[PDB]
Amino acid sequence: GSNPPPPETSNPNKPKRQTNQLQYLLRVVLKTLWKHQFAWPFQQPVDAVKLNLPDYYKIIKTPMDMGTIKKRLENNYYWNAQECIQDFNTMFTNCYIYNKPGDDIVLMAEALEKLFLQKINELPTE
Ligand SMILES: CCN1C(=O)c2cccc3c(NS(=O)(=O)c4cc(Br)ccc4OC)ccc1c23
Q1: What does 25-45 look like in DSSP terms, one character per residue?
Q2: Which atom of ligand 1 is nearest to the CA of 105?
Q3: Ligand 1: centre distance to CA 105 (Å)
Q4: Which residues form each disulfide bond in the chain?
Q5: Buried (b) or exposed (e) across 78-110, using 16+ Cβ within 10 A?
Q6: Taking the domain 19-123, which CATH number applies?
Q7: Distance CA 28, CA 47 (A)
Q8: Residue to substitute in 88, 105, 106, 108 for testing ligand 1 pocket (most ligand atoms within 8 angstroms of CB)
């Protein structure tokens, strides 16, 4: 069972820009989540080979991770903050779809999602 190619972190013809909200998302929101104790399983694409998860990409068809999100923010992949947030929401949702209520990884994702939502409320006005 091979790995799919990871999600793109740059695209010539996908519209993109910088906003102060996207700056906040990188320097504050992503940074704090990256540093959290529970971040590590979310810091790179699911390696279905070496983690022995042969069914992962059978269930999950739109994978996302914080490694991808960080690269995207650094490269200014996004048009707005809402597109980035959708990538975080995809990451969390994948975890909840693939796993079961109360699983270790699900409990970690909920803790990260709680901190994310808190950080998201203090997002600059423009
Ligand atoms: C967050 C992405 N992700 C999973 O949804 C998932 C499910 C099961 C194992 C692993 C996984 N393998 S692991 O060795 O880091 C792992 C972490 C935790 Br927390 C609990 C169990 C486990 O492997 C069995 C890495 C990333 C993910 C998963």
Answers
A1: IIIIIIHHHHHSTT-GGGSS-
A2: 19
A3: 6
A4: none
A5: beebeebbebbebbbebbeebeeeeeeebebbb
A6: 1.20.920.10
A7: 27
A8: 105
Task: Give 105's contacts (C-beta < 8 A, 6+ positions apart).
Answer: 41, 95, 99
9-41 per-residue burial string, b: 16 or more CB within 10 A, e: under 16: eeeeeeebeebebbebbbeebbeebbeeebeeb
- In angstroms, what is the resolution? 2.3
Cβ-contact 14, 75 below 8 angstroms? no
Could you give the CA distance from residue 91 to residue 88 in angstroms, rounded to a whole number?
5
Kindly list the domain boundaries of the chain, sorted by start residue.
Answer: 19-123
Contact 84, 72 (CB under 8 A): yes
Q: How far apart are CA 44 and CA 34, in angstroms?
A: 11
Contact 73, 25 (CB under 8 A): yes
| Residue 19 to residue 113: CA distance in whole angstroms | 23
